Design a protein around this ligand. Structure first.
Ligand code: HEM
Ligand code: HEM
Ligand SMILES: Nc1ccc2ccc(CNCCCc3cccnc3)cc2n1
Ligand SMILES: Nc1ccc2ccc(CNCCCc3cccnc3)cc2n1
Ligand SMILES: C[C@H](O)[C@H](O)[C@H]1CNc2nc(N)[nH]c(=O)c2N1
Ligand SMILES: C[C@H](O)[C@H](O)[C@H]1CNc2nc(N)[nH]c(=O)c2N1
Ligand SMILES: [Zn+2]
Lengths: 403, 404
């Protein structure tokens, strides 16, 4: 019934009762746990999801049962009955975006969940208008390096009509150019999107950090290509605090992590284009983006620069190089005065989050495998904390690639 | 396509399906509504079906499934359970079961070695004194002057209306944990209760950080008896660092042999409450968990201060730097001492090979991602990028309540 949740560093026990509010199935069954899989394998449906969200919204503003509540419930009921769908008021939408972030089991930055700038872009009719919105989002969120969490929401999906979509997975992404000799110049995670941009008329560069154009799509139209003004895109050159040779590597990363391919679901309504951004945790760049074998894969180069023994795993050359790389990222962002958080500070704030949420809602959906950082796992408090995972709505979801 | 879990590796792009999970007979803690995969500890009718299942497994592994000897063994087990309420395994059945339990263990990253396990039959054991003799033999054989060899020793099974054989200690080798007057702990905080239990049973305690605990051994329906291990039997490795010359002066050490002793070995519904087993260490167990956990030796700050690191701020990555060097010291010293050890890279690489062997051999491999991924350098090792399916196969090692 209710999960017993234990922290093994401190011996404390909580009991998750929030999970009882879950209405969507995850991938596990009693026969087998599939919690490490990255991706998932009528009018009353909409109406119940809508009622529940409205009920959540009016509860949040401490006005459940009131005249405005009862009335809003009928507007919704009448609109669905007549049209098969309905629309959110902006304030509701602001509440919904905030709750979807709050409910995101894989996010370690949820201490911040109540501080989210919400742009209503539901009055958008063309890819061109999507671009103006995206450009303003970037300017707002970047804020000269004093980063601010933000989401822009484009029109919801509608029965028998194509979706608004941003084709890129993030608003800022480095091109990955496939060389005929097997290798890849740039970011190999972005080969396919780079090729789509080229096919749709983009003239390609040939560096390792070429900022890609955005491919934007309004419903049932071919996507259009837009180059971001280079001044909107704040980047941080990487240097190391004591290893002067490091800056010679020419490494750099962009300040703004702005994710553009997820679908935002609120009250049964689906927003297929709703880019959001906050700020980086240093390991995203330092460990995953730069050291993952299927990414920039710079572990060996840095190791040689440090003059370690590559011939054997037991010299822990990989661990040593990785730590300096992460250190280069933290030092550099702090130097360039751009918001960033290290994995220790982040995980410590997440524990406080678990505690606030335990008192606020009786629990907190969390995916242990995603919350635990990719280096120095057990050196962080979250490693030793048991977590319960489940789907609450509003929620961010994955969705198929539009091509 | 197929109606079995699809399993992806995100580094390589490769896909497999787990058909093996279809053989699973026991429910884990998850449901469609919530995943509980990160929690550490979540009648003759019943017996016979488990026994029938294991016998089928056994004859399958020797390629005699459906044969005359298969059906006779089944009938023999049905009859034995019919007259005594339990039954007994043949020696080769015990050997197969023990190995299958290790093979089936989802949290073990060392399973590439599973077919190479020396099985010591000790189902003839009738006293605590004899358990000790058995245990000492195990330690000597397994330690092998540093060229470690996997082994398990199996004492008699749970009997209806009879007390269990139990080893009270969680390992055969454990450092004492002395609760101090000032509230703190000397030695290993993990071992406070077993330490106090030993003293309550007449052990005279030391006062070191690294006092080897006596064994508390229990034959059926008798009070546990106390046995001190002769020190030459317990191989230890003093820790030093290959370049940081001061590390040796910390006086840190660890023992060679990880020999877990509080787990229950289940085979065909039979329960072996006392069946200590041992392999060799992955270096992160000592370097990261035992030495760096807040609630264990907690030496991160000491080492960092010695390395002259800025421990006032998280962003200096002083915890990460110190952790690495500690782990490096564990590896270096074990190698120098010529004691078997595997680093977290070599271990995880070998586990990927195991997943590929078991894909071909059994159509999958139950695996607990949170335990398979090492506690430092996670995404630096290949298993991080590998999806895994977790489920309970039998024969199995299970946790069991503490005897007191
Ligand atoms: C403000 C500081 C933030 C920090 C430090 C942070 C940190 C992180 C990290 C490290 C991850 C793991 C991502 C990965 O490994 O690819 C993540 C995931 C995620 N974040 Fe946050 N995040 C922040 C803001 C936000 C905001 C503003 C939103 C939405 C409004 C959000 C929603 C999500 C979601 C839905 C995931 C799961 C992504 C997926 O499953 O692919 N986060 N976050
Ligand atoms: C041969 C070298 C071996 C290595 C390197 C190895 C490695 C490991 C590691 C690192 C763990 C994680 C334990 C923890 O973090 O507390 C583990 C767990 C485990 N191992 Fe292995 N292991 C080996 C041999 C064995 C053997 C011989 C057996 C039994 C016959 C075995 C059965 C288990 C079981 C049941 C677990 C899960 C323990 C638990 O859940 O508490 N292992 N192994
Ligand atoms: N700092 C932040 C904040 C929020 C983030 C949200 C998402 C992401 C990246 N999402 C995971 C991408 C991996 C993937 C690949 C294929 C299919 N699904 C997911 C980073 C964030 N960083
Ligand atoms: N190298 C090896 C080989 C086999 C091992 C088997 C078990 C263990 C430790 N088991 C986990 C103990 C921690 C714990 C505490 C409380 C409740 N559950 C588990 C190590 C092995 N190492
Ligand atoms: C297979 C495994 O679930 C997958 O590689 C996950 C593990 N944990 C992760 N955690 C984070 N933060 N990001 C990731 O991409 C992943 N990948
Ligand atoms: C809460 C969490 O499950 C717990 O800290 C686990 C995580 N993974 C682990 N992995 C291993 N190998 N050993 C452990 O003790 C643990 N502890
Ligand atoms: Zn699960």
């Amino acid at each position: 019934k209710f999960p017993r949740v234990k922290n093994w560093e401190l011996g404390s026990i909580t009991y998750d009762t929030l999970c009882a509010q879950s209405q969507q199935d995850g991938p596990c069954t009693p026969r087998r746990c599939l919690g490490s899989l990255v991706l998932p394998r009528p009018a009353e449906q909409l109406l119940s999801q809508a009622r529940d969200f409205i009920n959540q919204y009016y509860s949040s503003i401490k006005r459940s049962g009131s005249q405005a509540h009862e009335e809003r419930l009928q507007e919704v009921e009448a609109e669905v009955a007549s049209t098969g769908t309905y629309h959110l008021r902006e304030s509701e939408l602001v509440f919904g975006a905030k709750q979807a972030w709050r409910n995101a089991p894989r996010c370690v930055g949820r201490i911040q969940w109540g501080k989210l700038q919400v742009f209503d872009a539901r009055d958008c009719s063309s890819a061109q208008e999507m671009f103006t919105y995206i450009c303003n989002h970037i300017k707002y969120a970047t804020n000269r390096g004093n980063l601010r969490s933000a989401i822009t929401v484009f029109p919801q999906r509608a029965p028998g009509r194509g979706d608004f979509r941003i084709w890129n997975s993030q608003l800022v992404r480095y091109a990955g150019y496939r060389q005929q000799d097997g290798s890849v110049r740039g970011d190999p995670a972005n080969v396919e999107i780079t090729e789509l941009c080229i096919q749709h008329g983009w003239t390609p560069g040939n560096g390792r950090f070429d900022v890609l154009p955005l491919l934007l799509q309004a419903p049932d139209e071919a996507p259009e290509l837009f180059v971001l003004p280079p001044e909107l895109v704040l980047e941080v050159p990487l240097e190391h605090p004591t290893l002067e040779w490091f800056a010679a590597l020419g490494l750099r990363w962009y300040a703004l992590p702005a994710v553009s391919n997820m679908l935002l679901e609120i009250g049964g309504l689906e927003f297929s284009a709703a880019p959001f951004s906050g700020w980086y945790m240093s390991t995203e760049i330092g460990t995953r983006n730069l050291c993952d074998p299927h990414r920039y894969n710079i572990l060996e180069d840095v190791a040689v620069c440090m003059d370690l023994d590559t011939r054997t795993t037991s010299s822990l050359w990989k661990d040593k190089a990785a730590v300096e790389i992460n250190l280069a990222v933290l030092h550099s962002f702090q130097l360039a005065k751009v918001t960033i958080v290290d994995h220790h500070a982040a995980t410590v704030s997440f524990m406080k989050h678990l505690d606030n949420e335990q008192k606020a809602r009786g629990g907190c959906p969390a995916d242990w495998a995603w919350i635990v950082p990719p280096i120095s796992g057990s050196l962080t408090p979250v490693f030793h904390q048991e977590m319960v995972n489940y789907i609450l709505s509003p929620a961010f979801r994955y969705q198929p690639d539009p091509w």
